[PDB]
């Protein structure tokens with residue numbers, strides 16, 4: 001069956017693990033345990049196609065930035081996550097996109113911009129600002145909440161649909 005290699009990237013604490021675990025395991029991780037690098041696999045049907053999602057949950061702590069090159073080489077599609085209550089995390093997106101662009105030597109890498117924690121009211125990144133960033137990258141913007149599950153499947157499945165346009 002077709003396999004899709006997804007990689008979830010973004011600053012520390014934005015909810016990469018919580019999103020991935022919500023998708024794969026259907027529960028919300030409330031506690032905060034920083035990730036080094038974990039892998040998840042699951043067979044799922046997306047638009048009629050049985051496929052295997054292979055998902056890499058990466059480190060947001062800058063200490064582990066040396067590991068990015070390796071996972072960017074291997075990944076087919078990138079979920080670029082910030083939190084809508086973390087302006088700095090939104091600004092950090094560009095450094096991830098730029099490295100992906102270098103490593104892939106490509107301006108057309110399958111990606112989806114994700115504004116997570118949309119259940120929280122302390123928003124400092126408005127939808128339109130993120131829409132604009134995604135537009136400049138040629139990619140979709142989707143808001144999510146790992147806590148409520150809002151948008152979670154949509155974000156990951158959209159990334160599969162972007163890889164398929166590639």
Ligand SMILES: Nc1nc2c(ncn2[C@@H]2O[C@H](COP(=O)(O)OP(=O)(O)NP(=O)(O)O)[C@@H](O)[C@H]2O)c(=O)[nH]1
Pocket residue numbers: 010011012013014015016017018019029030031032033034035036058059060061116117118119120144145146147148
């Ligand atoms: N309210 C709310 N809290 C969230 C959401 N996603 C994550 N959190 C919380 O934010 C904290 C960090 O989540 P986590 O998934 O561990 O972030 P991370 O991006 O994987 N961290 P790291 O980069 O260090 O591995 C946790 O306490 C988690 O419960 C969300 O959608 N809504």
Ligand SMILES: [Ca+2]
Pocket residue numbers: 027028029030
């Ligand atoms: Ca829980």
Ligand SMILES: [Ca+2]
Pocket residue numbers: 107108109137138139
């Ligand atoms: Ca692009």
Ligand SMILES: [Mg+2]
Pocket residue numbers: 016017018033034035057058060
């Ligand atoms: Mg994590």
Ligand SMILES: [Mg+2]
Pocket residue numbers: 124
């Ligand atoms: Mg503002």
